Write a protein that binds this ligand. Structure first.
Ligand SMILES: Nc1nc2c(ncn2[C@H]2C[C@H](O)[C@@H](COP(=O)(O)O)O2)c(=O)[nH]1
Ligand SMILES: [Ca+2]
Length: 581
DNA sequence: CGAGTCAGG
DNA sequence: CCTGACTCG
């Protein structure tokens, strides 16, 4: 470990402000909202510089350089720095290259989380892993200034050298536009969404928490009665001892550890003993309480009564976003009790409203586009109820002969075909035999032979090329596609069929977000994006903007790309997220 | 901190 | 098929 030379600067000079630089604005805290910036590094043609943040960020020339978009910066995780700067009232502009997002497009499977891991991709090893410098556990700490300053300078030096080879490879992959015109501009939009946050009505939440605690308390006693003794209901082991050993309930399923107590199992067991539907009710209410009442309350900021999620833009293997702390992509919607949680998410100004627009069946629509199946494309061109139609074709019955159970099964087929669900997968979800499931699937392929062609083709393409691709050229490598293990190979085959479907739907909505943000600005609307939930966008805006958004938002989303079938977008607005339905 | 469970797509 | 949070041992 020899030293990399740099100026440990005590003040900002003009040569620190060239119009191209690798920049590091280092935020050590995992969650970067309102977090400290611990140090700054700049590398450019004139040399290598460490600046303390109290100096650099009080310097009006450095600040102006930060916000000048003609001063081009290369970074890693620009969103982290952008947001932590927004919290100090400082704008970051002119980020022309984000190494994190470059690594993520070249290979999402690398799990690139720091500069050093991106650097390894190009055999560059003169930089340490953040974990090696900072530590990990309760032991994660900012080191002393010489250790820190060298680490930041090494990171910036790595960014300066790696930009060339990352761009060369993106270019060869035809992903250069995906980075420059899609992921990098999206990064700025997510930063605004995160910084803006979502207002929470903590009273509504605390009241719901009271009612839940009362019910949960009733159901808790009833379970202790029905078992003739008290035990930890949240312990799957202890519960498994009450059900299958004290009460003698049949064992239909085992886990790898012991007895399964998963919902699926428990519904099957419901007829034999009363305590079963109480354990089910308890699980339901206990999830709402500990995760959605207690969990949400703990992360709202008492300064603003907002939650500020972080959208992970470089995590998922398909090009989706994810969301953390809080996860605002899994707020309950399916059952009414949980859905009421959404009444707690409110507009951030008085006389503003929540507006939600969602693609209708985007994944099936994309499948129809990519497979070019005549029947499926016709169904969408007719805007048919797609599950009813699938039931008609697979059971060869007419429309008003479709029973609700038949529609439910065609629906489970439509849900699974977008990832090439196997006969076993479908049998499981439908509670039927694998041979019956195989038949449904065989009937599906007779009605949608283009889907079948697609599934065979995409698997051959994954084998020959080594990867699959989405509409805007995102990639996923699938080395398991040739494995001699059947289970392993089967998974890779489902990933081959799913990834272009799911990833292309991620592409489209990401584009919609970019187009929407440009149109909102052109229109000078005060409306702004709050959330993305995979196929849905949630905004808040003045009440006076609602009629305009009813037209503009679906429009932008529908026209984001042009497929062989229309994209269809529904939209709703109201006083609270719950009411925007 | 792996496993299980369950919330969403 | 793609996720994240909570709890337990
Ligand atoms: N790995 C791990 N095992 C635990 C813990 N507590 C109880 N057991 C068994 C814990 O914190 N970690
Ligand atoms: Ca407990």
């Amino acid at each position: 470990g020899s030293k990399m030379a740099f100026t440990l600067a005590d003040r900002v000079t003009e040569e620190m402000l060239a119009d191209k630089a690798a920049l590091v604005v280092e935020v050590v805290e995992e969650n970067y909202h309102d977090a400290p910036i611990v140090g700054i590094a700049v590398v450019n043609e004139h040399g290598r510089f460490f600046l303390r943040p109290e100096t650099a960020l009080a310097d009006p020339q450095f600040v102006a350089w930060l916000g000048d978009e003609t001063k081009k910066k290369s970074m890693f995780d620009s969103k982290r720095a952008a947001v932590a700067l927004k919290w100090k009232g400082i704008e970051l502009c002119g980020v022309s290259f984000d190494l994190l997002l470059a690594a993520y497009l070249l290979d999402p499977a690398q799990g690139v989380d720091d500069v050093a891991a991106a650097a390894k991709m190009k055999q560059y090893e003169a930089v340490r892993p953040d974990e090696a410098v900072y530590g990990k556990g309760a032991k994660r700490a900012v080191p002393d200034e010489p250790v820190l300053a060298e680490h930041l300078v090494r990171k910036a030096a790595a960014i300066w050298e790696l930009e060339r080879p990352f761009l060369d490879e993106l270019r060869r992959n035809e992903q250069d536009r995906l980075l420059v015109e899609l992921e990098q501009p999206l990064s700025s939009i997510l930063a605004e969404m995160e910084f803006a946050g979502v207002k929470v009505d903590t009273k509504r939440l605390e009241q719901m928490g009271k009612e839940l605690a009362e019910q949960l308390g009733t159901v808790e006693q009833r379970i202790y009665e029905l078992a003739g003794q008290e035990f930890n209901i949240n312990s799957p082991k202890q519960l498994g001892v009450i059900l299958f050993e004290k009460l003698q309930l049949p064992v239909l399923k085992k886990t790898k550890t012991g007895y399964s107590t998963s919902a699926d199992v428990l519904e099957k067991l419901a007829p034999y003993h009363e305590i079963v539907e109480n354990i089910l009710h308890y699980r339901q209410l206990g999830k709402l309480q500990s995760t959605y009442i207690e969990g949400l309350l703990k992360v709202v900021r008492p300064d603003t009564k907002k939650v500020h999620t972080i959208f992970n833009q470089a995590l998922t293997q398909t090009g989706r976003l994810s969301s953390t702390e809080p996860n605002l992509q899994n707020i309950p919607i399916r059952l009414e009790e949980g859905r009421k949680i959404r009444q707690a998410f409110v507009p951030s100004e008085s006389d503003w409203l929540i507006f939600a627009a969602d693609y209708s069946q985007i994944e099936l629509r994309v499948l129809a586009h990519i497979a070019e199946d005549d029947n499926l494309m016709e169904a969408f061109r007719r805007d048919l109820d797609i599950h009813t139609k699938t039931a008609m074709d697979i059971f060869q019955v007419s429309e008003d002969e479709v029973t609700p159970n038949m529609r439910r099964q065609a629906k489970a087929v439509n849900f699974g075909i977008v990832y090439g669900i196997s006969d076993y997968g479908l049998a499981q979800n439908l509670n039927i035999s694998r041979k019956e499931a195989a038949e449904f699937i065989e009937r599906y392929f007779e009605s949608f032979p283009g889907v079948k062609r697609y599934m065979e083709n995409i698997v051959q393409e994954a084998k020959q090329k080594g990867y699959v691709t989405t509409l805007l050229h995102r990639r996923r490598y699938l080395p398991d596609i040739t494995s001699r293990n059947f289970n392993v190979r089967s998974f890779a085959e489902r990933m081959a069929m799913n990834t272009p479907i799911q990833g292309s739907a991620a592409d489209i909505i990401k584009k919609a977000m970019i187009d929407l943000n440009a149109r909102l600005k052109e229109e000078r609307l005060q409306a702004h994006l709050l959330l993305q939930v995979h196929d849905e966008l949630i905004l808040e805006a003045p009440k006076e903007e609602m009629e305009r958004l009813c037209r503009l938002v679906p429009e932008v989303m529908e026209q984001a790309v042009t497929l062989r079938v229309p994209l269809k977008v529904d939209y709703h607005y109201g006083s609270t997220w719950y009411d925007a339905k």
